[PDB]
Design a protein around this nucleic acid. Structure first.
Ligand SMILES: [Zn+2]
Length: 259
DNA sequence: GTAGACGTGGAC
DNA sequence: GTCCAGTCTAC
């Protein structure tokens, strides 16, 4: 998931867990636990703490407890669900947080790529993986100036620039491809070749795209212009949508609308 | 940067 | 059977 999908998870999950106290933490795939390294220590420190809140930073979820903050990245297929501790678990459940009321928060991840870091609240934003993240796209911190500063300083493609979480946090393959189309810019061109008018236009479309996506609860898939539409006619000009590889990933675009 | 890594499963 | 699908990393 990207910012919109993670933001949607944050909103619906919060009311289901706020105020609940942790009684036990069970881990079925240790690799997911990154800090502390020892999964036994990870489990023991959260016992007895109550969930006080849930925030998002980039594509990360930040569970706020009493003293600690649990930082979770879903990567490609991680997902959360709340259910009764009396029912059988679903396939690929790797971590489970059991509460004192008999309910539990389950974490599933088919590909096992997700990660979890636990730090004291005051240290979380200063340690990895949150430490070097760029500004939030829906905040005053992100502006054309910030984009320009990083753009006019590299030779890599504009898609690579946008996928770099240190530049701006939250964009992935789907929204980078969609933002570039709406702004009318080819994904493979040098980030340093973009004019001042283009950068402003891109900033405008990035904010609007991510904003509309959050409103629709993420993929909004019915409002996609290019992602996954290769071979189909452009919604704006009718030219067949094409797909290639840019910055080591599948990239979708319209050869006429984007220049 | 442009591929391959890290587990697992669906499309063709 | 076999190519494709968020960060890291090493030829
Ligand atoms: Zn078009």
């Amino acid at each position: 998931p990207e910012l919109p999908e993670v933001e949607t998870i944050r909103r619906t999950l919060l009311p289901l867990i706020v105020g609940k106290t942790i009684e036990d933490v069970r881990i079925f795939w240790p690799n997911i636990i990154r800090h502390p390294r020892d999964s036994e220590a990870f489990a023991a420190r959260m016992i007895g703490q109550t969930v006080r809140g849930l925030e998002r930073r980039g594509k990360f979820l930040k569970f706020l407890l009493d003293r600690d903050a649990l930082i979770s990245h879903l990567r490609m297929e991680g997902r959360y669900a709340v259910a009764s501790a009396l029912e059988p678990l679903e396939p690929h459940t790797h971590v489970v947080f059991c509460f004192t009321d008999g309910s539990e928060l389950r974490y599933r991840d088919v590909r096992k790529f997700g990660t979890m870091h636990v730090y004291a609240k005051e240290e979380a934003d200063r340690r990895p993986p949150l430490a070097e993240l760029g500004p939030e796209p829906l905040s005053p911190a992100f502006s054309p100036a910030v984009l320009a500063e990083r753009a006019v300083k590299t030779k890599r493609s504009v898609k690579a620039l946008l996928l770099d979480q240190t530049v701006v946090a939250g964009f992935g393959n789907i929204y980078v491809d969609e933002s570039l189309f709406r702004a009318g810019i080819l994904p493979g061109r040098p980030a340093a070749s973009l004019s001042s008018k283009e950068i402003e236009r891109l900033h405008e479309e990035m904010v609007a795209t991510i904003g509309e996506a959050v409103m629709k609860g993420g993929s909004f898939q019915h409002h996609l212009y290019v992602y996954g539409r290769q071979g189909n006619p452009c919604k704006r000009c009718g030219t067949p949508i094409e797909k290639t590889v840019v910055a080591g990933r599948g990239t979708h675009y319209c050869p006429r609308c984007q220049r």
